[model samples]
Target: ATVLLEVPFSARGDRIPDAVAELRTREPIRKVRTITGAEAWLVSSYALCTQVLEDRRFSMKETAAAGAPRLNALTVPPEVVNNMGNIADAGLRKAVMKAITPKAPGLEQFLRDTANSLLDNLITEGAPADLRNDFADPLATALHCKVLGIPQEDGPKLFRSLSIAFMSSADPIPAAKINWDRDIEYMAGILENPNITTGLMGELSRLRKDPAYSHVSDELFATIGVTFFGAGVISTGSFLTTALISLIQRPQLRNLLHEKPELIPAGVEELLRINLSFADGLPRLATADIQVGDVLVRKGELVLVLLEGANFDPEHFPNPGSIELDRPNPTSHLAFGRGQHFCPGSALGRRHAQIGIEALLKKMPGVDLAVPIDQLVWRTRFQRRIPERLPVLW
Candidate 1:
């Protein structure tokens, strides 16, 4: 008898497990065990991962259904699973999208300024800066605060909720609820505050009082604030941190991009394509029987669409491991995911990393790891594969 391989082959974001490439070639679609001890279909390979993501029948929201096989316990309340759907249903999608667009006036400048300011602080403090906490994470927190129109001082408290808020575990996390409820309360107050008339939260505050949106629930208004803030901060912070590591390790590419700033966008896209930030495969509960690769995924079964599997598949992205700036299908990678649930924050995320990287390369052209690569501690059983503290030097 053979034991099923556990999903999330490894937590080390710096390296993709050898098992992934082997599995993609050998059994692109196979059974695996989740942290919750539930049987799941771990779909590797570009075609299979794309199939699962494109099919609406494979449901992200249903993964929260009672008694369903889970990828991991829900971090937010079950109802909050359909966050984007709820936002669309409430007719607030346009406003939310508009507020987050990287093209929003002064948004890119804000990101650039924030990145430079953070780097300046780090430089003043001298060598061996904790980039993860002091630079990348603070940039993310500040960006979200500006996007959400919240006080910058309030960001750390909201960010503290994320360590527990994004846990991947077998059992319900009590602290997750405690933090969620408290964060919700804070967001609820944001909708009522008259001085908050500026960003996403500000727009939401106006909509809350508008008679046309009167039917929208208070719960949804609060949920949007908490979810958007948490997701944006965690996603951008983690991706920027890992992308910095990727770039820092490639001095040739770093120097090239630093010299030719025009290549920064392409470099950022390549970075996104190869990012190992997501710790778990994108989870979906099969809503109907679907044939994916060699496997027949059944209804109500859990399916994990491994992003790295698709991103690194040698067939699609030639010389998958190398950071090639001239690739034809660069943006096609599932970094921001695909299909109905494609990340809404893609543009903003791209801008965040682009500005962050641009600022870093300009400010600290010699940036390198302060510690040995093996000494960097990776966070486990969490949503993103980030180092607990990214110590760095220039």
Candidate 2:
């Protein structure tokens, strides 16, 4: 009997599984069983992963189609699966994109100020602080609140929804829907609130009333708020948390960046490439029969594109494990993905981490894990792989 291998292999974000390297070298495209008890093709090589993402036939939105083999149950409504597509269809893509850029005049300054303030509070609280909750998550929540034009005080309330909101489960989550409804109501109120006159929601509110965009649905307006807030906060916070672990583990790299701030951006790029944040692979549903590597993926079959597999592939990124700041292909990793569905917040995400890391190193050059690396509790069955609490001392 051939035993089926089940993913994700391991939940620790600090290290990539050794099996991933073996599989990438041997069978780049192979079958694996998901939590839902459905088998899907797991593509792990850099080339095949890119092939699947660049080809439109491998559909992200169709993963939500009725009866499609799922990597996990959908967290949002089926239609929200094609979020960027919906934004484009609603004619709000430009405004939304414009609103999210890291170059929004004082955006960088705001991130620096926020990161510094969070670090200052942690410093005041003394050693053995929970960096994930005290610093990283709070910084992400504040940044998203500013970008969304929501009151900073409302951030923690919205942020509280993410643990349930981003769960990757075998069956539908009831609490997800409850939080979704409550969040939607909050967003709809933001659209009508007279004092809400800045950020993405403010722009969305104006467009909602414009004669040209009057046809757009109120559901979409609210969905945008809930979706963007959840995604942005979860991703930035998780990435920063893991990145901090990676840096702390590499004292030489940390000291180098602390001494020369100009190198922070390159260091951030390398960190992004090596990040094991996405716990589950990026899921896609094949719309047509397609030949991927040695297998013919049939229509309606589910495919999982492993980001770490591509990022760590030695053939593409030479000496993949070591973070060499001078690497020529620094930004070429699939960290933000590829093709039509590439992360729109890539710039913002990069800036957020850069500022957070910059502020942290300056504030606490001696920062190190207060506990052993293995003692950190990794969050499983969740969208991103992050420690539940990162205890650090300066």
Candidate 3:
């Protein structure tokens, strides 16, 4: 027997509701009717969510499968996503990773320099800055702009489009198409250029040397580039803002980071784990019947692996409520995801976050929010639970 609860039973704030905790204890794999009237199995337990994520029985491939349960109205069509693996060359993936992320030398310093550059103007302005607008947003866009081998002037427009597209995921088909056309036009022009022999596209060009990617199409390249921009820009921006927000909310933790800078790596992991950015969970489909925990997820069913729910699962993480700096297995959080679907840019994203935090703490140690904590506004962007704008002062 499945229990059909409301879509976002777990609202964002200081703590998740006891309902989720109760579900994890009683029905780890329970059915819920989403706000839009779609059915899904919300896996609340950490073990159950991991099992669903790792099992091949549950597939991202069947999202377009007929009769698949729709979690939200704003979802990408299956046709666009079905052949991503075939189009995204593994060789190109590794090449891009090495250049843009921790795998490359001096990348951290570059990120720090970039962070410092953004902050210089903010510091001069004195106080009352939109941290997300002035800092986190641009830093994320600029870094990915470097990765894509495109100029920074055009990156902001592209990133803004992605942010809109990401937030409007549950909007009607035409809404998504509008943003898609904008991105497609931008990416197509970039890919069609002869001088594109740098960044991720440069790696893609190199991949064409091998027979493996010889048949990869120009449109495919354009599509993959858009995906990278979205993931690198919007998602990374959310993570950055959330990290700062957490520090601001917990002033003690912020002081601790400033005083004991060596604890940043571990602190970053804890921040990532407790981020409210992903309360909506990862929506996956079932290609075959799968038993998750005590529930049977039948074929063609939608299963949402609630990452936040799993991250705070007490069995895996003791004292899951508290953000302990020295928490055991800090990197165990599913913020970057798990299984074969793990983010290739995990190292890069982590470095981006660390550099952003470090630069802020060092330069503006007295920074604090300009408005009352309760006055902060939020945007319901797809899987992201993000602050609309982080107003801060030093």
Candidate 4:
């Protein structure tokens, strides 16, 4: 029994909430389908939302349950994920975690600097410029390079390759995956060099040396590098791009945060509430019987949680139609998702959002869209949403 009948995935591009608004209002939990033919449960309640998120109920691991949902059709094999086939032989998860912490403490600053430098260049290019190209895309591409040890010179090449992989809708994704795999292998070669030890590649090296974590092999570590670097770059870049759009739409609110810079953090929440960097729904298949807001979903069913719908729900956020810079309640939104897969990159993305947008507002106080808002072109090839170019004029 569906509490909400969604606009089919083919037409979801128009306005996703148009279809799910009724379910979100009448019943918090409902059944729905995806771009692919999969059954899913969609939820919007704040309490129940993270409950399903934090609870070990949802499994990212395939072996944990036969019904685990996958991020995409071309899922990475367990061997590639676990690092069993790699050199480090340490648990790939642990090895990868090391790069983000303890040793790589200055990553946030590095990302900020990368973003700021670009802003400086744009300022030099002077006044009228596209925010997406001048600030969002290049900054995002640069950060991905620095974070994963992709050489600065090669960064544009890989960024272009990644864009192609994502934009190639006519071709099966796996076809693009082949090119991505080759690119990753090239990145790994760069990481293998001695000087590259301080970035993501270096941490993976330290993991390999520690015989204690012999679970993730070197090959698996390389694979982790591939996935994390790719995700960190694209997701952060796309989210920031959309965030710029949201800010442009609400100039007054954008100004409020601009004058009072501390509100920038609040702005990140507001952005997450509406222009979620990812998708409206993240698929989760039921491993056992569970009650999601009155609906008792059966085992093996897919639960596609619609963070977008819930974020827009009037119940939790009140007046879901507009951006609230000073909204009383904050941080509860599922922008980073919840629980096990609560987007490990949340801190970084938040930081980037903080730096990227704040810099624009601060440096270019006279900034406005170079083209009319309605004239903006949105990228539709993949799940990510972004503008082809965000033209701006000072």
- Rank by lDDT, highest first: 2, 1, 3, 4
Q: By summed lDDT, which 10 consecutive residues of candidate 2 come out lowest?
A: 1-10
In model 1, what are the clashing residue pairs, if there are any?
A: none
lDDT tens string, model 2, 1-394? 8768898888899999999999999999999999999999999999999999999999999999898898988878899999999999988899899999999878899999999998898899899999999999999999999999999999999998999999989999999999999999999999999898788999999889899998999999888988899999999999999999999999999999999999999999999999999998999999999999999999999999999999999999999999999998899999999999999999999999999999999999999999999899999999899999999998
RMSD of each: 0.9, 0.8, 2.6, 4.0
Greater-lDDT candidate between 1 and 2: 2
What's the CA RMSD of model 4 in angstroms? 4.0
lDDT for each residue of candidate 3 in 35-128, tens digit (9 for 90 to 100): 5577888887788888877887777767666556776654454656544464445335555556556645455676789899889998888778
Error of 2 at 189 (Å): 0.2
Q: Where does candidate 1 have its weakest 10-residue lDDT segment?
A: 101-110
Better of 2 and 3 by TM-score: 2
Give lDDT for model 1: 0.92
- The residue ranges of model 4 lying beyond 4 angstroms of the native Cα positions read 1-16, 63-72, 75-95, 101-109, 124-128, 164-172
Residue 71 CA displacement from its true place in model 2, Å: 0.6
Clashes of each: 0, 0, 2, 19
Question: Which model is ahead, 3 or 4, in terms of TM-score?
Answer: 3
Clashes of 3: 2
**Highest lDDT among the candidates is held by which one?**
2
For model 4 the TM-score comes to 0.84
Per-residue lDDT, model 4, residue 141, is 74
Candidate 3 local Cα displacement, residue 378, angstroms: 1.2
